Design an enzyme around this catalytic site. Sequence first.
Site, short mmCIF file in Angstrom:
data_model
loop_
_atom_site.label_atom_id
_atom_site.label_comp_id
_atom_site.label_asym_id
_atom_site.label_seq_id
_atom_site.Cartn_x
_atom_site.Cartn_y
_atom_site.Cartn_z
N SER A 10 0.81 -1.22 0.00
CA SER A 10 0.00 0.00 0.00
C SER A 10 0.85 1.28 0.00
CB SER A 10 -0.94 -0.01 1.21
OG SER A 10 -1.86 1.06 1.18
N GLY A 43 -1.84 -4.36 1.30
CA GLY A 43 -1.92 -5.55 2.13
C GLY A 43 -0.97 -6.67 1.78
N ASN A 72 3.90 -5.59 6.10
CA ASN A 72 2.69 -6.34 6.44
C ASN A 72 3.00 -7.68 7.14
OD1 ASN A 72 1.22 -5.07 3.45
ND2 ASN A 72 0.30 -4.78 5.48
N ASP A 153 -5.49 6.56 10.35
CA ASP A 153 -4.85 5.40 10.97
C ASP A 153 -3.40 5.63 11.43
OD1 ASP A 153 -3.45 5.37 8.62
OD2 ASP A 153 -4.45 3.59 7.78
N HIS A 156 -0.74 5.08 7.04
CA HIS A 156 -0.58 5.34 5.62
C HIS A 156 -0.53 6.82 5.25
CE1 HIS A 156 -2.66 1.37 6.05
NE2 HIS A 156 -1.73 1.00 5.19
#
EC number: 3.1.2.2
Length: 178
Positions: A10, A43, A72, A153, A156
Amino acid sequence: ADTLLILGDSLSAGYRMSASAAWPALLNDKWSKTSVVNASISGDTSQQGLARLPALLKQHQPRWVLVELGGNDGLRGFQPQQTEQTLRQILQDVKAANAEPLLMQIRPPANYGRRYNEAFSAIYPKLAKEFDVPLLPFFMEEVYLKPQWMQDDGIHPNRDAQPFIADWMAKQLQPLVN
Ligand SMILES: CCCCCCCC(=O)O
């Protein structure tokens, strides 16, 4: 004429935004000189990235491959050893494809346990040495210093940040792509 292949997650694919809004698209627009192919999927773990690599190499025959994976792995039941081994195969495939691998340093959240964090982070310097390849800094280190460039979050980078990440990457990659 030459192609730079980006194998990432991502951070490179863009989170909750289109690929066109992600910094790699802006980088490509900044460069008909060098073609940037963004083969990143949100992801994706280092393993999922490795699984796509073979096809991408034979398809794009890139001169350089930017590897941005591992972030991840921790949340996906993986140990530093596993991640290290996965990335090791990635670098091998790249070289075996007569391409120059460019590894990016990855750093897990400050709250993931020192035991794991220091072990995880050490994977990159080690691999870069083992294969003798460029080891780019984790671009997110500069993004964290600007809350206005982070999504809620706190993980990102947002839309506003992509243009800056694009210029930063251009500078980092410049000497590496001649
Ligand atoms: C704290 C840095 C690690 C996060 C990597 C983001 C992974 C992804 O969404 O596809």
